[model samples]
Target: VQALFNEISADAVFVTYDGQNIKKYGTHLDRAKTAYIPASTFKIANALIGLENHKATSTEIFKWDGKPRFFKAWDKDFTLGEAMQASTVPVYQELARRIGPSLMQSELQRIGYGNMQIGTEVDQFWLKGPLTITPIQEVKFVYDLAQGQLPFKPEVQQQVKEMLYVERRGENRLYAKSGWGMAVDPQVGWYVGFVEKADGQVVAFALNMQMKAGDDIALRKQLSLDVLDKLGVFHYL
Candidate 1:
């Protein structure tokens, strides 16, 4: 397993709850931290911010015009929740535009998205805009979100949690967001979130990778699932 992980050049951190205790793995011990582009994972925070500020809702309708949006092939009609499930850049960009850059930046900081740099332009899309986050910071944010300590109200958190994707019949439910982008090196992918255990414990993780442009998303998903399985989280989706 280690050989396969190394072969793909993956970096991940897993936090697990063992009965009464929590355990950490891989790069979880770092404090100063390394920076990485937080692709679609920012949507998780954005969702929370939107809920907290009353910009949108889980069932809120956000229609996509049947035209070239941000991406050429994106579907035209979607709700915020469906957009989250699809990771549609157009929907998120529209939300960012409506929410405005200053509010988004302030909400992000309020929600503990530290070191984020939002430009002065309100129309600037967040998913494609300037954003940076450290692994440690990402993990910490996940932890706080799971613990309900983030700036978002409890109801907002609940709404955000409802949009989370998890596999069927899993022992734990996961609230997660994934991100992908083209960088100077190649493409960067990120997955960050927390798993709510049946026993009421939560395990947070931040998995990141920088791969060639043609890197397979399926492979990355498999690697992440394998890592979770190794950490004894296979019961969860």
Candidate 2:
């Protein structure tokens, strides 16, 4: 893992929780415990909140207002699944506004998400925030989600989990979410999720790295998949 981060010339931490054990990698163990802005990765929880509160639905279309955006994909409309897959910020920001700060705070607290502080902006805290979560916390949260152990109703948890689905390779189904904290200096990047293998083993993981230019963004996912592959998780294909 250290060599993988070294290859990219980026400092990072990868942490995983597999049922009973917690494993960590990277040159610095301290980085695993340090918290950073979750950025769009908050969508995992946001989607849950939106659905549970009946503010949004997975199949419902989110209309695009034709505003120019950072990513080309965000310029168009999206359903909850599409918005999540594309990491569409505006749509989520809209959902956050609809979810409101009070309920958002309560939900975050219920799930024990990070600092549970939504700050003043209902739409910006995770991106710019007083909210931050360590890689360790990320893995645990994802593990709980994967195991359907969160406080949310089983149906709600299952629905949100399906929205997070990336793809299935052989006997393994991988579900993940990525985040980029472009609003901060020394930008932070995250790839966090879990893998459910054929034998029913579930391993949840989180990876965060110090990123430089736009190109470095790809490393957030590639490096994570590589590390998991190295651990003999599965061929990510």
Candidate 3:
């Protein structure tokens, strides 16, 4: 994956494990530290914020009102857990609306999302949500959350932890959050997460790509999987 990424002229890439930098490539642009719109991955923060503020819970359900909602799709009713798994923008928007911007902003700031920008109106810029995050900061937040140091209560932390944990691959558990956008290029892609290795090693990575807007999901997965393979993480998957 590293070779392919290097061959493709990736503008920036960084990987870490257990609070240590593992690999780095590209110009290491300062924007890496500047928050870009987090795409769907911001949902992770939204979930955490809602949980901390007592506005929502893992089991809370948002029922469809049958109105044409922004970004609405097949799902009608959404439990908070389902919303995270489905990456349901409308449900998250509903949560944001219910929580209100000020309270959401406060919670985000408290949870180390101080650089994020919440939208003023409903569903406007839903893809971007006027937020930004540096790669370093992103990894830092995930690390802290994994270590149980986030400001949220322990129960809330457990909920977020469970929600963030993707299925295990082999004996390793993979936790990840992905973002998609068009900030640095016409098309953008992301694979950010950590892997728990069979040998008791843990690694965190942030892989981003810039390309044309219509790239296929399979190709993106291949790129990320290849990178993980290169990093010797395929065993975990």
Candidate 4:
């Protein structure tokens, strides 16, 4: 795993949890526990918070702001499902505003979100605020989420989880989110989520790396998948 991430002079962390086992790995493990920009990684919580507070419905369309946007995929409307898949920041930002800072802060507090600080703007907190989280916190949250342990209604949790589904390869169903920091230096990449196998086994993980200019950010997923592969996360029985 170190060989995979070290190639880029990047630091990373990968943690996994099953109901009874929790594990952590990597050289920059300390950094993993320190907070940094969560970027789009916070969307996992945003999705659940939106559903739980009735501020957003799975099928509801988040109308685009109609201003020219940088990402083509985000320049149009999005439903909760589409937004999560695209990592569309603007759409979720709007949802943050509609849900209001009070409910947003309360929900983050309830879930023990990192620092739980939203700065002065509800929509920009996770992206730009002091809001940050450790890789351990990320794995813990996803572990609880996979098992339906969050405070949300059972259906609400299920909805958020469903939206997290990234793909199904052979017998393994992968649920993950990718985040690239845009605040300040814009040199960090994040990939976090879990993998569920056909026979009911689940493994949750989180990884973050410091990137360089012209760095192949795709390694964020490459290194994470490489680590997962080393862990012998099989696709079948």
Candidate 5:
């Protein structure tokens, strides 16, 4: 894992695995327990909240308002599933607005997410904070999702899990979400998820790194996958 980070220009990287026993890597394991803004990763919880509140539906399309977005993909219409796959910000912001601050606060509290603070802007909190989560916390949250142990209904958890699906090769199915906290200094990047192996063993992980440039942005998923492969969590290809 150290070598992987060396190959890139990241200032630091933190990774933790939650499985048979907890495992951690990277030069700064301490950062793994420190909270940072969740960025798009909050979509995992946001999606659950939306589904539970009936503010978002899997099949309904979230139409674009003809406003251009930084990411071209975000400017197009997308269903909840597509919005997640594309990591569309507007759709989720709209969904958060519909979910409302009161319910959003209650749901975050019930889930025991981050600091449980939604701040002044309901739609912007996760992206900018007072909503924050540590890498250890991320693995724990995802581990529960993998075990069907989260507080949400099984159906709702299942739907959000489906949205997180990345790919399946042979007996391993990988599910993950990437987030970039662009609003913060020394922007942080996150890639968190779990892999369900053929033997039914599920390994959940979270990785965060300091981003310095656009190239470093790709490292969020790249570094996580590299470390996972190195650790024998999965054999890609």
Candidate 6:
């Protein structure tokens, strides 16, 4: 997985796998401290807040406001499941609006997310805005969330987890979020979540890469799984 970064760029690509303790890779392995914009991964928290406050329900459709969008597919309504699967930014940004800044502030602190700086604009903050979290921190957050350990309603956390289910690849069940911050010049890419082994041990990970123009967004997922595959996180049996 670390080699994958070498093929891409000289720029930093931070990765962390947290199960027993965090094992780091690529740039700044010891610290994994260089924070970058979280992009769509911000919606992981946004979705949590939505369910917690009932701004949106995991099962109910988060209706599209009929606003025009650059991505035609994203213009339609979605359930929490669809929103998460599609990584629909507008749907989540609306959720942030309904969640409001005051609640967002408290919830960020409560969840120990990122640098805890969401800035004044609630909708754009997680874009290329001020709030950022390191790869290590990202892994830790999901690691706890995977085990149903975050400080929220058990059902709500489970609800988000349910929405997060990606698919089963052989013996490993994958659950994750992919984030891309295109607002920045270089752009930011992220894949954060966990892999459940057949033995039931969960290996949580967070990967962030600096992307040049036209880089495939799906590589975020490929690189993450490659690293995990190298680490023997998945059991082929």
lDDT of each: 0.66, 0.87, 0.67, 0.81, 0.84, 0.80
Q: Put down candidate 5 lDDT per residue, 1-237, tens digits, no spaces.
A: 677776655555555555556677876667787899999999899999999888878878898899899888688999887888788988999999999999999999998998999977889999877898888888889889988899998999899899899899898999999888889876888889999988988899888877655554566777778888888887767
lDDT of 1 by residue, 1-237 (tens): 455556644554444433344455543334226566576777777778777777877787787676776565466677777788778877777777778878987877665575667767543434455666775677677677777777778877777766765553446676677777664344666766667767777777766666566677676556666777776665534
Where does candidate 2 stray beyond 4 Å?
none
Q: State the lDDT at 149 in candidate 6.
A: 86
Runs in model 3 deviating more than 4 A are: 6-12, 26-31, 68-74, 114-116, 122-126, 182-187
Candidate whose lDDT is highest: 2
How would you encode candidate 3's per-residue C-alpha lDDT over 1-237 as one tens digit per residue?
445656655555655556766455444444355555667767777888788878888988888888876555634898877777667778888787777878877677666573746667534433654666666666667777777777878788779878877768778887877667755444456667777778987677666556566566555556655767766776533
Q: How far is candidate 6 from the true structure (C-alpha RMSD, Å)?
A: 2.0
lDDT of 6 by residue, 155-192 (tens): 98888887889979877788999988888866777888
Distance from true position, residue 99, model 6, in Å?
0.9
Number of the candidate with higher lDDT, 1 or 6: 6
Stretches > 4 Å off in candidate 1 = 9-32, 70-73, 122-129, 183-186
TM-score of each: 0.84, 0.96, 0.83, 0.93, 0.95, 0.91
Query: What's the C-alpha lDDT at position 187 in model 2?
Result: 86
Per-prediction count of colliding residue pairs? 1, 0, 4, 0, 0, 0
Candidate 2 lDDT by residue in tens digits, 12-103? 88888998988988766787888899998999999988988899888899998887988787899998888988999999999999999999
**lDDT pick, better of 2 and 6:** 2
Superposition TM-score, candidate 3 onto the true structure: 0.83
**Given candidate 5, what's the lDDT at residue 93?**
92
In candidate 4, list every pair of residues with a backbone clash: none
